[PDB]
Amino acid sequence: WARELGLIRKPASFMTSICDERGQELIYAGMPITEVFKEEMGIGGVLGLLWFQKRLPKYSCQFIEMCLMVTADHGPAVSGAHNTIICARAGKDLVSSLTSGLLTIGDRFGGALDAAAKMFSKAFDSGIIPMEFVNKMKKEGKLIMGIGHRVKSINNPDMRVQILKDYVRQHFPATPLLDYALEV
Amino acid sequence: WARELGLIRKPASFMTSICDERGQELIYAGMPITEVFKEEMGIGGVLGLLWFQKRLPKYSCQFIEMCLMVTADHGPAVSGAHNTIICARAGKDLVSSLTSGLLTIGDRFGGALDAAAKMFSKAFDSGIIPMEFVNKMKKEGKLIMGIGHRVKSINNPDMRVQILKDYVRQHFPATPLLDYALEVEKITTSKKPNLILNVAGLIGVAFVDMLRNCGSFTREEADEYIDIGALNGIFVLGRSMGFIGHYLDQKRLKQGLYRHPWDDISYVLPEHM
Amino acid sequence: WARELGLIRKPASFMTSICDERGQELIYAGMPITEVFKEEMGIGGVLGLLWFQKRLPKYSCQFIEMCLMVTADHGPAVSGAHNTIICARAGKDLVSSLTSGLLTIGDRFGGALDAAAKMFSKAFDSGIIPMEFVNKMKKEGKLIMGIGHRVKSINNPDMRVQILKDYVRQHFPATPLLDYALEVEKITTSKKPNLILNVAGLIGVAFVDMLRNCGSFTREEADEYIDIGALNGIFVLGRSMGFIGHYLDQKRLKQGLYRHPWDDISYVLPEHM
Amino acid sequence: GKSTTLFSRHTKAIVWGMQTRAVQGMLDFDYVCSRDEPSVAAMVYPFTGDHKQKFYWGHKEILIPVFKNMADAMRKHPEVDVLINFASLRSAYDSTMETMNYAQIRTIAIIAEGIPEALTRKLIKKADQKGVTIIGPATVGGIKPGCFKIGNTGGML
Ligand SMILES: CC(=O)SCCNC(=O)CCNC(=O)[C@H](O)C(C)(C)COP(=O)(O)OP(=O)(O)OC[C@H]1O[C@@H](n2cnc3c(N)ncnc32)[C@H](O)[C@@H]1OP(=O)(O)O
Ligand SMILES: CC(=O)SCCNC(=O)CCNC(=O)[C@H](O)C(C)(C)COP(=O)(O)OP(=O)(O)OC[C@H]1O[C@@H](n2cnc3c(N)ncnc32)[C@H](O)[C@@H]1OP(=O)(O)O
Numbered sequence: 001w002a003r004e005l006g007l008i009r010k011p012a013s014f015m016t017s018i019c020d021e022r023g024q025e026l027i028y029a030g031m032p033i034t035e036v037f038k039e040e041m042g043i044g045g046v047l048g049l050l051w052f053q054k055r056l057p058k059y060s061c062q063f064i065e066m067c068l069m070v071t072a073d074h075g076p077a078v079s080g081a082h083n084t085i086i087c088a089r090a091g092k093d094l095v096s097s098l099t100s101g102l103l104t105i106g107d108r109f110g111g112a113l114d115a116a117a118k119m120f121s122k123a124f125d126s127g128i129i130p131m132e133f134v135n136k137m138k139k140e141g142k143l144i145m146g147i148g149h150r151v152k153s154i155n156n157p158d159m160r161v162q163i164l165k166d167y168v169r170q171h172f173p174a175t176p177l178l179d180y181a182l183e184v
Numbered sequence: 185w186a187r188e189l190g191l192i193r194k195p196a197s198f199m200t201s202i203c204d205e206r207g208q209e210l211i212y213a214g215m216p217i218t219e220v221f222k223e224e225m226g227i228g229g230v231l232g233l234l235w236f237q238k239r240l241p242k243y244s245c246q247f248i249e250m251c252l253m254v255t256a257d258h259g260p261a262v263s264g265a266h267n268t269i270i271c272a273r274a275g276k277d278l279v280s281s282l283t284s285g286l287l288t289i290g291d292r293f294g295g296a297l298d299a300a301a302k303m304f305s306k307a308f309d310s311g312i313i314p315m316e317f318v319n320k321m322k323k324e325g326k327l328i329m330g331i332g333h334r335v336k337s338i339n340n341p342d343m344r345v346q347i348l349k350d351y352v353r354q355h356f357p358a359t360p361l362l363d364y365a366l367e368v369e370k371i372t373t374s375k376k377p378n379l380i381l382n383v384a385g386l387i388g389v390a391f392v393d394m395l396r397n398c399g400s401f402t403r404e405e406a407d408e409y410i411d412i413g414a415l416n417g418i419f420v421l422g423r424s425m426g427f428i429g430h431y432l433d434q435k436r437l438k439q440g441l442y443r444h445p446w447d448d449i450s451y452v453l454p455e456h457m
Numbered sequence: 458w459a460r461e462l463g464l465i466r467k468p469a470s471f472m473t474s475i476c477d478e479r480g481q482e483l484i485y486a487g488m489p490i491t492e493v494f495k496e497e498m499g500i501g502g503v504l505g506l507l508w509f510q511k512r513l514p515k516y517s518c519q520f521i522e523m524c525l526m527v528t529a530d531h532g533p534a535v536s537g538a539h540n541t542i543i544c545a546r547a548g549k550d551l552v553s554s555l556t557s558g559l560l561t562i563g564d565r566f567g568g569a570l571d572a573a574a575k576m577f578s579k580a581f582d583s584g585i586i587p588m589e590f591v592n593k594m595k596k597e598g599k600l601i602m603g604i605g606h607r608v609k610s611i612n613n614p615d616m617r618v619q620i621l622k623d624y625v626r627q628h629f630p631a632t633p634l635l636d637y638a639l640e641v642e643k644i645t646t647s648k649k650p651n652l653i654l655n656v657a658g659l660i661g662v663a664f665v666d667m668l669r670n671c672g673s674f675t676r677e678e679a680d681e682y683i684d685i686g687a688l689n690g691i692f693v694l695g696r697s698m699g700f701i702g703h704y705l706d707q708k709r710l711k712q713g714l715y716r717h718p719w720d721d722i723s724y725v726l727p728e729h730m
Numbered sequence: 731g732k733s734t735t736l737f738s739r740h741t742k743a744i745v746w747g748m749q750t751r752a753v754q755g756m757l758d759f760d761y762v763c764s765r766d767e768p769s770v771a772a773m774v775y776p777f778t779g780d781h782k783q784k785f786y787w788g789h790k791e792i793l794i795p796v797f798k799n800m801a802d803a804m805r806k807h808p809e810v811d812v813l814i815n816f817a818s819l820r821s822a823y824d825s826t827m828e829t830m831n832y833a834q835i836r837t838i839a840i841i842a843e844g845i846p847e848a849l850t851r852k853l854i855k856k857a858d859q860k861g862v863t864i865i866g867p868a869t870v871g872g873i874k875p876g877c878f879k880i881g882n883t884g885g886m887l
């Protein structure tokens with residue numbers, strides 16, 4: 001009652017800018033949910049709104065959807081799937097099993113995305129040519145993140161790299177870092 | 185400033201009764217920390233204060249310490265230690281690895297404590313004799329929780345059940361549920377030797393006996409603490425030591441990322457979906 | 458059958474050196490459990506065996522027990538206890554609530570132990586005097602980890618730092634890093650009174666002193682154990698008791714689902730994205 | 731000066747590169763030769779931290795140290811007298827030149843093919859100056875039945 005009258009001052013302890021639960025309509029980063037569904041975005045558009053507070057173009061949202069599709073699963077032999085299966089065979093819970101599997105996501109498992117992105121971004125921004133980047137990585141005792149496969153090398157590529165690369169080539173306006181990575 | 189003057193009313197959204205962080209001295213359930221250390225209790229006394237808000241007798245706190253000691257670790261082959269080792273070999277974190285290992289604590293793994301305690305408490309309160317309890321468990325298609333071992337049956341007992349049982353016999357005033365469980369154990373060992381009181385079952389029955397046989401708790405309080413999962417917390421706190429030890433062992437050995445061999449996985453995927 | 462005959466070769470995918478579950482008796486890092494209980498160690502001795510594979514002296518194990526006692530809980534206002542209470546009031550689980558609370562243990566919360574230990578160890582090994590260490594920390598825009606309190610400064614100390622410091626002074630053979638930290642504390646208290654050695658900083662320096670001052674460890678072993686996060690495990694194991702106590706308190710009080718008031722949240726969403 | 735007996739039953743070698751199959755074949759050869767100790771004392775791999783790799787001594791399980799740097803490997807293993815180099819044509823020269831800075835190494839085996847002839851001549855000149863016997867590049871190595879085996883020579887067991 002005192003706050004309604006504007007008689008007292010209490011600072012808010014939390015900040016948020018991705019979702020507005022209060023009000024007549026649910027809002028995703030300034031966009032109503034009905035307008036979200038009328039604009040015909042999917043998981044990619046909602047992900048962009050919730051994570052970046054941006055109205056991404058259709059190709060960006062579709063590419064985000066493809067990235068989620070290709071990273072969906074890679075068999076049960078990985079550490080995270082193994083832990084999820086171990087927790088599930090103990091009859092614990094869906095949430096507990098998924099959580100135990102996700103807790104292995106880090107540097108050695110599931111971190112090649114961010115590590116490769118950071119390494120290639122640093123190399124591209126430093127202005128060094130791809131050969132200089134390769135030599136610098138070699139002389140520092142570091143392996144280039146995101147480079148190297150187990151069986152598929154050439155004339156038999158990943159079949160997951162190819163689809164995403166084709167989509168990016170056809171739809172992305174400019175891909176400087178992708179070209180740098182392809183030279184590497 | 186308005187609250188200091190007592191001009192406005194704002195209900196508190198949270199309740200707590202186990203620890204008082206504010207003030208000149210830290211307080212554990214009404215007891216100052218300096219008085220906690222002067223009374224010479226250890227992990228057991230602090231555990232009793234924080235979990236039950238009771239000043240437990242010395243033997244109760246010591247027995248809690250023994251229960252934590254015997255449940256510290258049981259090798260790396262269990263699900264929780266396996267998960268902790270998997271997360272540690274991924275180089276994630278101490279907290280993340282211990283958490284991943286602890287998330288397997290539940291019905292099939294690490295829940296035999298609470299399950300055995302509840303089953304034996306229900307049997308004892310129902311007034312049925314141990315033979316009637318065994319027959320009722322048999323005809324219901326249920327195996328008695330806390331009964332049965334893998335190698336150690338008789339003339340070669342657990343060596344963890346024996347120490348706790350001796351301590352309880354020497355120090356506990358009255359052990360009705362423990363005697364009921366021992367009669368059940370006699371009946372089950374009359375069937376096949378390895379049907380002995382497990383460490384989980386023994387700890388459960390002795391914890392119930394400690395709760396409802398010491399003057400600290402009434403029967404309702406002990407029943408509520410058993411219902412809400414005090415023995416689950418006992419097992420989790422005990423096994424956290426072993427999980428952290430496993431994480432430290434894996435980080436000391438500098439083990440690389442683990443990947444399960446494909447020959448150990450059976451692929452039964454459909455023809456085409 | 459082929460392995461029993463020694464006909465085939467399959468390398469073991471896992472290594473362990475802290476617990477031997479197989480065999481007639483459970484073994485904690487080469488020590489039988491019956492011998493563990495006969496030697497009359499408690500939580501500290503089992504913790505030392507499982508984490509360091511060492512037979513620690515009695516004072517070291519007792520000091521580990523005191524460290525677990527003083528880090529048991531610090532009220533419900535901390536991030537970890539808050540998260541544990543939030544998960545408990547959702548009626549989820551003991552394991553889930555404790556896990557959610559423990560997942561906040563990291564750099565900003567619960568990491569002052571390891572951070573203070575590492576900072577003081579680096580300063581002591583670098584050979585710089587405490588005044589030089591203070592000046593170097595000041596000119597680098599870094600606050601000394603484990604230094605500074607909220608209310609208790611002097612003539613009214615922590616009452617948790619005092620007990621541990623007295624125990625270490627009476628029982629530890631040599632405390633070089635503790636003396637270095639106390640000189641740093643004198644220098645910081647010469648600036649403003651509340652810049653005293655925290656419980657986190659005191660425990661860190663005393664744990665390093667125990668590791669590298671008892672005959673169980675070489676300098677390399679102590680350094681490796683500090684690097685891999687032994688004090689993080691110490692804090693997590695200590696605070697797990699308080700987290701489980703908070704879960705039990707919330708389940709005993711029968712608190713409903715919590716929802717944060719909207720007046721405490723500032724909404725800064727963009728105009729239209 | 732270059733010695734006459736390059737390998738014996740007590741010869742200890744350091745392997746440059748992560749070649750687990752070749753080292754395991756070497757260990758199997760040593761075991762079937764009734765050798766007291768494995769012929770591989772340590773491994774050198776610059777793209778990882780120092781650790782221990784698990785190998786087989788007959789049916790027993792043993793650990794072989796893996797070092798990031800040559801200097802640590804030669805410090806902790808002064809009994810090593812042979813280097814078996816599994817570096818590529820783009821790294822064999824620098825690794826061999828670094829190896830010939832340690833006098834304990836008397837024999838170096840180079841497996842890489844495609845090394846430029848000028849770099850190979852420089853290696854030969856430095857080896858002749860240091861009196862180090864080099865098994866020429868683009869080779870499988872060599873075998874001394876009962877004493878020592880280089881790399882993948884002689885096939886599997
Ligand atoms: C998320 C990703 O896309 S991968 C990102 C990884 N990060 C990086 O890219 C960093 C740089 N890259 C590298 O680290 C390396 O170049 C690698 C790991 C990608 C290349 O892999 P390799 O070093 O050859 O090891 P690899 O994973 O292939 O394992 C070796 C073999 O074991 C086999 N194998 C893989 N998983 C299993 C399993 N669970 N069980 C049994 N065998 C397996 C593979 O078929 C492979 O076959 P091969 O014998 O023909 O090589
Ligand atoms: C926490 C505790 O103290 S136990 C939990 C309490 N649970 C209960 O008591 C519920 C009721 N009891 C029961 O379910 C059963 O009576 C049990 C499981 C306790 C008895 O165990 P069993 O049914 O014999 O199965 P067990 O676990 O012994 O496994 C069988 C064998 O595999 C062996 N084995 C156990 N773990 C492993 C492993 N990781 N790798 C290889 N072998 C193993 C055992 O040595 C055992 O030996 P055996 O061949 O001589 O029997």
Ligand SMILES: CC(=O)SCCNC(=O)CCNC(=O)[C@H](O)C(C)(C)COP(=O)(O)OP(=O)(O)OC[C@H]1O[C@@H](n2cnc3c(N)ncnc32)[C@H](O)[C@@H]1OP(=O)(O)O
Nearest residue numbers: 534535569600601602603604605606607608655656657658
């Ligand atoms: C684990 C430990 O022992 S602490 C380890 C922390 N790490 C370090 O030591 C790093 C170096 N030290 C520091 O960062 C600083 O010197 C500190 C944080 C330790 C000193 O604390 P301060 O900067 O004074 O902040 P502090 O935590 O006291 O909070 C300020 C006030 O809020 C009050 N307060 C604390 N918690 C709450 C709460 N939940 N609700 C309401 N008020 C609170 C305190 O009483 C304090 O009183 P004051 O107004 O008299 O200062």
Ligand SMILES: O=C([O-])CC(=O)C(=O)O
Nearest residue numbers: 073074075078109110111
């Ligand atoms: O996808 C890959 O090739 C690497 C892998 O196993 C994973 O992290 O999923």
Ligand SMILES: O=C([O-])CC(=O)C(=O)O
Nearest residue numbers: 257258259262293294383
């Ligand atoms: O302790 C036992 O005998 C069963 C077990 O493996 C565990 O849950 O720790």
Ligand SMILES: O=C([O-])CC(=O)C(=O)O
Nearest residue numbers: 530531535566567655656
């Ligand atoms: O103990 C303290 O003074 C700091 C604190 O709140 C905690 O992390 O427990």
